[PDB]
Amino acid sequence: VWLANPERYGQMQYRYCGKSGLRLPALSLGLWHNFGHVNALESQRAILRKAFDLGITHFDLANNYGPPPGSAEENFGRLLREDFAAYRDELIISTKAGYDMWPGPYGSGGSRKYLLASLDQSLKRMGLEYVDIFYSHRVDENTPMEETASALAHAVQSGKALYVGISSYSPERTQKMVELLREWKIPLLIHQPSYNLLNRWVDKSGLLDTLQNNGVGCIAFTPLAQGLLLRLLNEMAQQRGQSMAQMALSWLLKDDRVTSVLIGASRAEQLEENVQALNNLTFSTKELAQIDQHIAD
Amino acid sequence: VWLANPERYGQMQYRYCGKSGLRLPALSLGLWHNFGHVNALESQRAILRKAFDLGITHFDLANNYGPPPGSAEENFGRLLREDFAAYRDELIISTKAGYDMWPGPYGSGGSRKYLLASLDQSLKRMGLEYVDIFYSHRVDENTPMEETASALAHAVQSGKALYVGISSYSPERTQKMVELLREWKIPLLIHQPSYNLLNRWVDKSGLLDTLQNNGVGCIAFTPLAQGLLTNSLRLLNEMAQQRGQSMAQMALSWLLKDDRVTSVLIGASRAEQLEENVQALNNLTFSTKELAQIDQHIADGEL
Amino acid sequence: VWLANPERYGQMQYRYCGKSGLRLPALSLGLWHNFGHVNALESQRAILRKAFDLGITHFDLANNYGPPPGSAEENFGRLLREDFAAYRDELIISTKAGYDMWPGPYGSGGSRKYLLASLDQSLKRMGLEYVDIFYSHRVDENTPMEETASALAHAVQSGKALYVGISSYSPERTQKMVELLREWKIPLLIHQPSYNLLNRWVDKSGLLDTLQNNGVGCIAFTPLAQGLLTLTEANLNSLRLLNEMAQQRGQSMAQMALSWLLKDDRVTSVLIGASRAEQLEENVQALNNLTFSTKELAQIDQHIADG
Amino acid sequence: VWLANPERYGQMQYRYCGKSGLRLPALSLGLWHNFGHVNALESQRAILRKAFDLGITHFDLANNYGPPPGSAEENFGRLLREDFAAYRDELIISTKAGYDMWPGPYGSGGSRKYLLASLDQSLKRMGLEYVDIFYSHRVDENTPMEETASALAHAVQSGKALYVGISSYSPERTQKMVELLREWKIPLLIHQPSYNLLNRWVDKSGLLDTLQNNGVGCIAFTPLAQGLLTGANLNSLRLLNEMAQQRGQSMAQMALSWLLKDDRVTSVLIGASRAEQLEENVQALNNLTFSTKELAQIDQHIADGELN
Amino acid sequence: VWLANPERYGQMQYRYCGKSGLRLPALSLGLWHNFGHVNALESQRAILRKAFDLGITHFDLANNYGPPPGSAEENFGRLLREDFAAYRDELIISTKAGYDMWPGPYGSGGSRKYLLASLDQSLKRMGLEYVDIFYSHRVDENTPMEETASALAHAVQSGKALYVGISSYSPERTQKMVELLREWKIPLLIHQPSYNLLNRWVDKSGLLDTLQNNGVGCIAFTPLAQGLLTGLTEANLNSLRLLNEMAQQRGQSMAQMALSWLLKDDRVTSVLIGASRAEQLEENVQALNNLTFSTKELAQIDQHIADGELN
Amino acid sequence: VWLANPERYGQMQYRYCGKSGLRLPALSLGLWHNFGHVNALESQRAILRKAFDLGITHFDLANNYGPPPGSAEENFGRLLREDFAAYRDELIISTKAGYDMWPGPYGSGGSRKYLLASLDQSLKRMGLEYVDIFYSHRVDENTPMEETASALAHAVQSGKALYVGISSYSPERTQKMVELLREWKIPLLIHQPSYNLLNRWVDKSGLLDTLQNNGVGCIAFTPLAQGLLTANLNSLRLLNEMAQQRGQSMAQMALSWLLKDDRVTSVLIGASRAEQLEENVQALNNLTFSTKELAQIDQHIADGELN
């Protein structure tokens, strides 16, 4: 029997996701790695408990997370049922479908067959009635976006997803998806792109403006560039009373354009450091220019 | 085994809720207080039985009613299943989500998350398939109304709420909510404002006109100003006495004086308190003189 | 174990219900009487089996049928489950809500509360997932039609009713209800008015035109004027003359009265009742002679006028 | 316990079904024959296993398939549950309602009563929550298309069909059905017409243009003309068989290849009474190209032998 | 919603059933007739409500009661569920298997097949988890008693019957049934013989002593001789008239005397009355107002039965 | 919907199974062959309907019947649910465990593991709460009989089998099994040995006396010697002539012979199509054999070395 920390909501900053009423924590936990059947459940248990104790109320999954595929969802579902029975309504749980999950022509992409069948498998694996957010995980150029949007819409209407999002869509396709979902009176909630100090396709392409103009939120995937977050950038971090990682997360969160950043963990202690990034979210024009200069150099 | 009074529909006055075909009793029972786990179930049982025996067919709950939060809904659900199995379809049951219910950022406000997760908790706690009326309990300035209205719409479409209402919304926001719900072919049924002799924001702001112009009903919350309507207060009590009424009765009769108010929400800690409040129906007429003197005493006492 | 007559679909005439694809039998069985807890179940059983054996595939109920109220539905549900498990998809089952069913302000009328709660009770009493036709049983002047039409719509969308109908609505209200149901992309299927030789409000008011112009079907309630078509001396004299006309046509009074309603494509079906199985055979023979001459029609009207 | 061939997706060609994202195998298995209670379940089992092992992911049923009616669905449901529990989401399963299924006025046609009741019976017989494609099996002149389309729409909304199709509708009726289904924000997925070398109403009537212009797919029913395209009239059939041989194909293979010659046909519906028949038909994919000359000579032999 | 009369337990006499702790009402309602699908449910409803309002807590069914067979149980199950939800644990419900119920060689008799399949059908029809009493309805000479007794035992062990009884078994077979049931640690609760003023095989055969000696109860079936003991050779008619006069001298109707006679001593646990309408029950319960008979009376009753050849 | 022949109980003879109250039909249908997944369900359906129409109320299965193993039980279960929902309680259904069913050391023999798990599989395959008779299908010399008897006992107590039997047990083991079951207050119901005109081990070994003395029934397996009873040739010809003199086919005489006295409760016939049943049940028309006839049958078997 497990009692969550009563102060869990005291430090975490929460941000409204676009124009919606849903507040995500500034740091969200992704289950991309470390939650498969190759990892011991006890490590996983400790991570989830700690995350929630730090006020991280958002846990981001996908059908194919593991390895093997589906195992993150299964393990999460088990821990949910053992430790979080009394807390599910305090959690925002996402899953996704779009990458290779199972073999053959219905196990990948953006068809209504794949998306609705996969959502059903995801719900079964996790032991849920609905996910809070269901995503199309990537663009499928061979499925009309009408079909994808309409599958997402069915997910909402049937009560299997409270809200929907998209991941790794260009600005043009994001804009079309906003429009198609509006034909069903569904606002696109959120976009999940890969975005970090070293990879600014999001700024450069104008995706952040498309998101803001449509009131869609943004949650940054691989905010630490998969480990890379040179010596000079670390010195700048130290001058701010931050580790490199903390500065990198603080940088994404410096302004209201990013809703949240997706961190990962293989053990509980790694989470504490990352949430401290909230202690210092301000950057001077000078600092920003010097950061850009070191990256260019 | 409990048999409800067969004359229960003989004395209560029922009023159409706005333009709708749903008739609320002129007095409705709110479970704001006295239905928590801090109160004995047997007292609670007597109150519900009596309420229904007097023709009060409407019972108004909210997720956070208790204490502790949710307990009113749990206790109501238990009494419903023991004493009202055969009578549920004679009852109008409401609940609501908007105030602090559970901790964290999804436990409060007007988001689709909170409202739909709360309606599910409420339905479970009460052992119901659906509520007759589901409310947004208050304005959330940080949630777009589109999201709130659309959560309410989902509740109706999925068969979890027969009708929907709002509580403590300004005339402007009420008007927008009527419009947004109309986009889903759902008429807003009812508005629940706090309204009593001492608190007329409802008249002054023009909310009653907005309601009437949109065919939305109105049910007064805290019609007795939380006890105050049980020097200027003494004078008002004297006016009540001249009418053959307690202060409480006059205060209820005043809200019901005209067709603008659909119902008033009374509470009770014991059965006998209900009979007195329903007598307010015996004298619902006020002269222009009486109304002017009531207002004058409120001015003079700075109430 | 009970095996329906394999020739059951060989004689009955079926008519498309307005512009819809649903065919009703020209005679349907109403459970208004004789199916309550005051009547023996075995008599009930024999009636239903016989009705279906004659090709009558439509059974028309209402929440308050009995007595006591609900009992027709309960009994029907029981007989459905014992004798008709394999035949339910060959039946059209209707129920209704609108008259006094249970006490208090939610037990009557046309509110969403009453209609949806009552459909649920009806489905539970009858042991069904859905009825084929759900009706608003009468006009409620105090409920906006928007609310009633929208309850009917919910019934269809939620899978509790395949189709919807109304009963005893004026031509104007019928027309509005068609329009409101069209806002939900639902066509009104059928109207059930009281209509027989002696009661032509339906013709006179222009309800039949409204129905035809909107492609809504029509099913005649009390087609035998509650017995009269089976009181002063002038009344009795005219009834005797009508009976003689029936005889000249090789028909009983009842048969002529049913044939008359069915003489043209304006009436989809007529609602017969029965307290015993043998009463059904005679009524379905009405189909043998559905033609009336201009002269015959004029003489019928004349005897009704004279009496 | 049965493990499907791991190379099953290596040889089969899949085609996008109209403008949709759903890819059907170029060859699909129809259960029109050989899956009734008159046929032994073991033969049936072998056929389904082999079909899937060859990459045929689409199995096409209808309420009345058997004999007796409903039995193909029952038998398929039983095999699905024994051999395909782990594979259902790799399958596209269709059924249909429109021909005579059960007696009386609700057991046939295009009414909402018939279609929704029949879909429920089909789902129960097959042990499924939903079919991937639900069809109206043919035109009913006496039911307004609004009613039919709206039943199909309910099927999708209620989660009993992922997609919907029609079978043996004229171009005009197909076009109207596309429009009516679009009022519910449902795109028509697919049209199933009877089409083969000897029966070209599809080409002649312009149905193929209607389909393409609306992004609807096409799956050819009776692609082998119920045997005639397998090994005066007889003289022309012999000459067509010789053309097949010159292409390194059996008659059957050429007949299937011909339907698949261009991107207009999404799939062809083959049948089988035993497993070995399937292998030959999928080899049709080895040669899908026809010259203008070849096409003209095929047509000529058909004209000369009056094979229309 | 239906509230049973709160005074229902004030007037009825209850008697311990043999040596057991189960008290049956002196008058029990049998559903042999008037509870079939050939009778209106509303009449049935009124009878049950009234019966219980009079303190009659025991309702005696059989698989084949109707007509048609099974319909009493079905109708009873419906009324139980509508009007007696809150009261089931205040009722003793019996059913039975032994006469022709369904066709073929398993639909009759005393075999384990028939009895256990029938009990399951009876429970399903009535919507019950268990009956309070399950009976073998009659002797089957072709089934060994070991088999019948063991089926009854299974019924108890499996929780489908609280207690078991037999109907219309001779004293010898009753005695063997007591012994066989004792091998399973089950006491035979009750015996249901046909017994009334005109049919005394029970007394004559010594069944009542076998019952008493084994602590088994006794409930009389057809206590009114199917109408004869209420309102044919001359001798018959004359004697029946004289018996009616004796009833009148006691301030009783014939029916009441007939019931009072069976209940005259502690040997008979209960008598099984029937009813086609609610008012018939009240009169029968008044029998309890006069249960005493003098030796002289008993002799004069016997004499009139002898003189009128009423056996 | 299928209505069984109402005269089904008019011709069949039923016999009490030993000292028990259970009456088996004189001919029972074994599902050893023709009910596997290799056979068409429609043929199977016809056979079961016809059997029951002829008053054959007993259907004898085993876990391994098919092929493939289990399929007879699955097919039977499906036909039971479609055509016999109303008739289950008019049927006696047996299954068995003892031969090779599934691989490994728990898939064969007489252990408690194998027997109880198999009964659970058989019940699941057939869609039943219980079988009427559960058999140990053969002797297992390596399981103590105490274990086997106790598994059978558990089957009865837990309500999964109404009665129990054994198949192909010697008289001495049969006797021990009667004793072991008696320790649980369970009477052995029935023994199923192979027995026919050509194979009399049952008589010779004294099994029929052991059965009778313990009140256990007997049901003959392979009563037609797997076809042979439909030098050697010369004797078979003479036996056929004797059959003809009796107005019987060879098969009929062979079945009539087994049934000639009260020693045999029933015989197990099989069918690949419905018409084969009618002939076999006619064997009941002539169940009497003179001493002379019996002596001549024995003589022809001796002369032809048909043992």
| Residue A91: closest C-alpha in chain B | B106
Residue E24, SS3 per DSSP:
strand
| Measured CA distances, C60 to A274, C132, C191, C215, C230 (Å) | 69, 10, 13, 21, 22
Residue F194, SS3 per DSSP:
strand
In sequence order, which residues have a C-beta less than 8 Å from that of residue B220 and are 6 or more positions away?
B192, B193, B194, B195, B196, B255, B261, B263, B264, B265
- Contact call for residues B112 and B151 (beta carbons, < 8 A): yes
Q: Which chain A residues are closer than 8 Å to D90 by Cβ?
A: 102-104, 106-107
State the smallest CA–CA distance between residue C39 and chain F in angstroms.
Answer: 27
Find where tokens 């059928």 sit: C190
* Contact status of A123 with chain D (Cβ, < 8 Å): no
E280 appears as a binding residue in the annotation: yes
Residue A170: DSSP 8-state: -
Pick D143's closest partner by Cβ from C21, C55, C162.
Answer: C21
Find where tokens 């008589």 sit: F203
Within a domain: F1: no
* Contact status of A98 with chain D (Cβ, < 8 Å): no
Q: Which experimental method was this entry solved with?
A: X-ray
* Contact status of B288 with chain E (Cβ, < 8 Å): no
Q: Which chain C residues are closer than 8 Å to B132 by Cβ?
A: 113
| Residue B184: closest C-alpha in chain A | A185
Q: Could you give the number of structural domains in chain E?
A: 1
Within a domain: C58: yes
Within a domain: A5: no
State the smallest CA–CA distance between residue B99 and chain C in angstroms.
Answer: 27
Pick F57's closest partner by Cβ from E105, E147, E157.
Answer: E105
* Contact status of D41 with chain F (Cβ, < 8 Å): yes
The residue segments making up the domain with residue F274 are: 14-307
Q: Which chain B residues are closer than 8 Å to A22 by Cβ?
A: 106, 111-113
| Measured CA distances, E266 to E15, E57, E301 (Å) | 8, 19, 20
CA distance linking residue D302 with residue D296, whole number of Å: 10
Residue B43, SS3 per DSSP:
helix
Q: Which chain E residues are closer than 8 Å to F132 by Cβ?
A: 113
Tokens of E48: 């049950």
Half-sphere exposure of C180 (CA within 13 A, CB side): 21
For every residue of D215-284, DSSP letters joined together read: T-EEEEBSTTGGGTT---HHHHHHHHHHHHHHTT--HHHHHHHHHTTSTT--EEEE--SSTHHHHHHHGG
* Contact status of A172 with chain D (Cβ, < 8 Å): no
Residue E181, SS3 per DSSP:
helix
- This structure's resolution (Å) is 2.4
State the smallest CA–CA distance between residue B1 and chain E in angstroms.
Answer: 6
Half-sphere exposure of B123 (CA within 13 A, CB side): 18
A270 appears as a binding residue in the annotation: yes
CA distance linking residue B184 with residue B186, whole number of Å: 5
Residue B280: left (phi > 0), alpha (psi -120 to 50), or beta?
A: alpha
Give the closest residue to E246 by CA, choosing from E294, E186, E185, E180: E294
| Measured CA distances, E275 to A64, E31, E77, E247, F151 (Å) | 72, 8, 18, 21, 50
The answer to whether the Cβ–Cβ distance between D144 and C16 falls below 8 Å is no
What CATH number has the domain bearing residue E109? 3.20.20.100
CA distance linking residue F156 with residue F131, whole number of Å: 10
- Contact call for residues E75 and F54 (beta carbons, < 8 A): no
In degrees, rounded to 5, the angle at the alpha carbon of residue E153 between the alpha carbons of residues E152 and E154 is: 90
Residue F131, SS3 per DSSP:
strand
Handedness of CA E243, E245, E251, E253 (dihedral sign): positive
State the smallest CA–CA distance between residue B201 and chain A in angstroms.
Answer: 27
Q: Which chain F residues are closer than 8 Å to C5 by Cβ?
A: none
Q: Which chain C residues are closer than 8 Å to D150 by Cβ?
A: 185
Beta bridge partners of D21: none
Tokens of F134: 């559960």
Beta bridge partners of F178: none
In sequence order, which residues have a C-beta less than 8 Å from that of residue A127 and are 6 or more positions away?
A77, A78, A80, A81
Half-sphere exposure of E131 (CA within 13 A, CB side): 31
The answer to whether the Cβ–Cβ distance between F40 and D42 falls below 8 Å is no
The answer to whether the Cβ–Cβ distance between B163 and C112 falls below 8 Å is yes
Residue D130's φ and ψ, nearest 5 degrees, are -155, 155
Within a domain: E3: no
My answer on whether omega of the bond before F105 falls inside 30° of 0, hence cis, is no
- Contact call for residues E74 and E25 (beta carbons, < 8 A): no
Q: Which residues of C are annotated as a binding site for NADP(+)?
A: 32, 60, 65, 167, 192, 222, 224, 226, 275, 279, 283
When computed from its CA atoms, the radius of gyration of chain B, rounded to whole angstroms, is 19
Q: Which chain E residues are closer than 8 Å to C37 by Cβ?
A: 40-42, 45
H or E element that contains F161: strand F161-167
First vs last C-alpha separation in chain F: 48
- Contact call for residues A71 and A33 (beta carbons, < 8 A): no
Q: Which chain F residues are closer than 8 Å to C86 by Cβ?
A: 1
Chains that touch A (3 or more CB pairs under 8 A): B, D
Instruction: Name the A residues in 130-149 with CB < 8 Å from any B CB.
Output: 132
- Contact call for residues C95 and C126 (beta carbons, < 8 A): yes
- Contact call for residues F101 and F152 (beta carbons, < 8 A): no
Beta bridge partners of C133: C94, C163
Within a domain: A166: yes
Q: Which chain F residues are closer than 8 Å to D45 by Cβ?
A: 37
Residue D87: DSSP 8-state: G
Within a domain: D233: yes
Q: Which one-letter amino acid corresponds to residue E174?
A: T
CB pairs under 8 A between B and E: 12
Within a domain: A8: no
The answer to whether the Cβ–Cβ distance between B90 and C113 falls below 8 Å is no
Q: Which chain B residues are closer than 8 Å to E6 by Cβ?
A: none
| 3+ Cβ–Cβ pairs closer than 8 Å linking A and C | no
E224 appears as a binding residue in the annotation: yes
Residue F49, SS3 per DSSP:
helix
| Residue F3: closest C-alpha in chain C | C1
| Measured CA distances, C148 to C34, C121, C179, C183, C186 (Å) | 30, 18, 13, 13, 13
Best of E101, E102, E106 to substitute, by most chain F Cβ atoms within 10 angstroms, is E106
Q: Residues D139-158, buried b or exposed e (16+ Cβ, 10 A)?
A: bbeebbbbbbbbbbbbbbbe
Residue D92, SS3 per DSSP:
strand
Residue B6's φ and ψ, nearest 5 degrees, are -60, -20
Residue A241: DSSP 8-state: T
Residue C104: DSSP 8-state: S
Best of C5, C17, C23 to substitute, by most chain D Cβ atoms within 10 angstroms, is C23
The answer to whether the Cβ–Cβ distance between D9 and A103 falls below 8 Å is yes
Best of F39, F41, F81 to substitute, by most chain D Cβ atoms within 10 angstroms, is F41
State the smallest CA–CA distance between residue F102 and chain E in angstroms.
Answer: 31
Within a domain: E5: no
